Every structure is written in structure tokens, then in C-alpha cells.
Design a protein around this ligand. Structure first.
Ligand SMILES: NC(=O)c1ccc[n+]([C@@H]2O[C@H](COP(=O)([O-])OP(=O)(O)OC[C@H]3O[C@@H](n4cnc5c(N)ncnc54)[C@H](O)[C@@H]3O)[C@@H](O)[C@H]2O)c1
Length: 321
């Protein structure tokens, strides 16, 4: 073990503080001081040390936490069903290793429902008898910020479902490139810190206390998770996407159900190219175990599901100069 117990402990402490500090600025202030990959590199090191010396994992470690503390100002939005993060992949190997773990837990190969990781803000919508009653941010996974109002200024968010059914679903809220571009040119004239990336613009907007502003910003959505099914009958993630659409939610069409891990990778390769042709920023791919009975079997860890993995994409910005 290249690292000695002392070297890893001290390193894990440095890493824990440094990373925690950065999370606070990124979630609790939507004003990060470091690039996302700088954070990711450091985060990845912590994970390696924690994996090499599990005895060093502490409750305060960022590996044990999701998102961040709620931005006071708004009303607290407890989550009846917890929200999480996802485990990341940065190589074809990671994708294959993930498949390898799954196969070992299921005992056979499984088909994956692949989707584009829409780069925006995480949201949760609550419906009671077809009526939109609450919209929330992910927060720290157990308590978000109530942003129902703000969310009602968004066209795609349906006010009443197609059936007077009660359900809870999650998805993403974003700002198309088209508008990110525009908005900024405007803010510049108003001498305001033009938004860094489409992600922070959306987050900066939705977490704005004055809906008056929010309304004019122009955001869209994509729903991809059913938290509380109510009377929904889908047994697979691929079906749930159809059902979510069918009851009135906007859902992303690029999804593809893959029967082999080779197909998953090709899907990843594919959209990594088409990327530019899309009107919305995507920060990767989300590979999901299609069968729900199986997702239940795999379960979650303190921070993320075992039945999914997110292949990360550097922002096209960094692939285009
Ligand atoms: N620069 C910094 O200081 C700093 C600090 C903290 C975190 N970060 C960044 O935050 C991110 C990690 O936080 P994260 O919890 O979002 O981890 P993650 O990037 O692995 O995220 C998954 C999230 O993506 C979303 N998503 C989009 N499309 C989806 C789909 N089809 N299916 C399922 N989910 C979908 C969900 O909202 C979900 O919470 C990284 O990009 C990291 O670099 C940066």
C-alpha cells in the first residue's frame, strides 16, 4: 500500500475539508471557486483513500453526503422519499466494471435503459389528484427548498396531470443553450456577472426568491424518475419514461434500451458526438438497470443507487476551443 496509514489519514483530512468547502460554495451559494473537474479529481482521490483505508471514512466526509444545506430564504421541503446522487464513470472500463458488479448481484446479464444526463438543476414534483402541489430542489437529499411558485412559471411543468392521480417524480430543470447565450449578452449590458455555465444559470434562476424575475428567464424540463408511483403500472425504467410522458410530463426522447454492455458504450459514444446538435447541455450519460425488481435488489449506498452509473462528459466548452 503506497500510502502509509499516516500519509493517508492526513491526506483524507486535507481532502475532506477542501472538498467540503467547495461543496458549500457550489450548492449553498451556486458560486464555486474551482472548476468542476478540479473538484472531481480531488474527490476521486478521497474515494481512493477511503477505499484503501475504510477506517478513515467519517460522517462528515463528502463521500457520505449528497448535495448541500438548504438556502434558508426558501421554505423547507422535506422529501417523503429520499433523493440521492449518482456514482460516476470516466472510462469505458468504469462502465464495464459497473456492469460486472451488477451481473454479480443479479446473477445474469441485464438490459440498461440509457438516458442523457441533462445538465441542469435537480427537481422533485408532487401531485395530489392530478394537481401540482409542490416543487422542490434536491437539497441535502432529505430536505430541499420549496420552489413551487418558481416552477409554475415553467411551461413544460404540467399544472394538472392527465389523470386525477397522486404521484411524486424527479427530473431536471434546465436552460437551453439558445437562452443561456442570450440571457448572458443581456446581463453584460446590465453589468451583471454573466452566468458561467447553463447549469448555474438555471440554478441561479430557480433559486431566486422573486418569481417576477424567474418567470422571464425561460427554463424547460425533463422527468425521468418515478418516486411515488401512486397508480402507475410501469415495471421498468423504459416503461416509466413512456408513462411519465403519457400522464403529461415532458420526457427526453434520446433514451435507448440496451441489451448488451457493448450497446451501452456505443450509446455513450453516439451521444458524445451528437452532443453539439442538441439544444440543451448534457454532462454525460446515465446508465440505468431497466428492471425495477432488479433495482430493488441492487439497492442504494448512503449516497447513490447501485443500479446506475453516470458516465461524465467534460463540458463541450472544454472540447471546443
Ligand atoms: N466545482 C466545484 O466546486 C464543485 C463542488 C461540488 C460538486 N461539483 C459538481 O457536482 C456534481 C456532482 O453532484 P451530483 O450529485 O449532481 O453528482 P452526479 O454529477 O453524478 O449527478 C447526478 C445528477 O444528475 C441529474 N440527472 C440528469 N439527467 C439524468 C437522468 N437521465 N437520470 C438520472 N439523473 C439525471 C440528477 O439531478 C442527479 O442528481 C459534479 O459534476 C461535480 O463536479 C462541483
Amino acid at each position: 500500500q503506497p500510502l502509509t496509514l499516516t500519509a493517508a489519514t492526513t491526506r483524507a483530512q486535507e481532502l475532506r475539508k477542501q472538498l467540503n468547502q467547495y461543496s458549500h460554495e457550489y450548492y449553498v451559494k451556486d458560486q464555486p471557486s474551482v472548476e468542476d473537474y478540479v473538484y472531481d479529481r480531488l474527490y476521486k482521490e478521497l474515494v481512493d483513500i477511503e477505499t484503501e483505508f475504510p477506517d478513515l471514512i467519517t460522517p462528515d466526509s463528502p463521500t457520505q453526503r449528497v448535495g448541500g444545506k438548504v438556502l434558508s430564504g426558501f421554505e423547507k421541503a422535506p422529501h417523503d422519499i429520499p433523493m440521492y446522487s449518482l456514482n460516476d464513470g470516466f472510462s469505458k472500463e468504469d462502465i464495464f466494471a459497473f456492469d460486472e458488479r451488477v451481473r454479480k448481484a443479479i446473477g445474469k446479464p441485464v438490459a440498461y435503459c440509457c438516458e442523457l444526463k441533462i445538465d441542469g438543476l435537480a427537481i422533485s414534483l408532487r401531485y395530489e389528484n392530478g394537481v401540482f402541489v409542490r416543487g422542490a430542489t434536491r437539497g441535502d437529499g432529505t430536505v430541499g427548498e420549496n420552489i413551487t411558485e418558481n416552477l409554475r412559471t415553467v411551461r413544460s411543468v404540467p399544472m394538472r396531470l392527465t389523470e386525477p392521480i397522486s404521484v411524486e417524480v424527479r427530473g431536471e430543470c434546465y436552460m437551453p443553450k439558445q437562452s443561456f447565450v442570450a440571457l448572458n449578452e443581456e446581463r453584460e449590458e446590465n453589468g451583471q456577472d454573466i452566468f458561467a455555465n447553463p447549469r448555474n444559470a438555471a440554478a441561479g434562476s430557480l433559486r431566486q426568491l422573486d418569481t417576477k424575475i424567474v418567470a422571464k428567464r425561460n427554463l424547460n424540463t425533463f422527468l425521468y424518475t418515478v418516486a411515488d408511483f401512486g397508480p402507475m403500472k410501469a415495471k421498468t425504467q423504459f416503461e416509466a419514461l413512456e408513462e411519465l410522458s403519457a400522464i403529461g410530463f415532458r420526457t427526453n426522447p434520446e433514451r435507448q434500451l440496451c441489451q448488451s454492455i457493448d450497446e451501452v458504450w456505443a450509446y455513450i459514444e453516439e451521444y458524445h458526438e451528437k452532443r453539439s446538435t442538441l439544444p440543451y447541455e448534457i454532462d454525460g450519460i446515465v446508465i440505468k438497470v431497466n428492471e425495477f425488481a432488479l433495482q430493488d435488489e441492487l439497492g442504494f449506498t448512503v449516497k447513490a443507487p447501485r443500479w446506475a452509473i453516470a458516465y461524465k462528459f467534460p463540458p463541450e466548452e472544454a472540447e471546443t476551443v
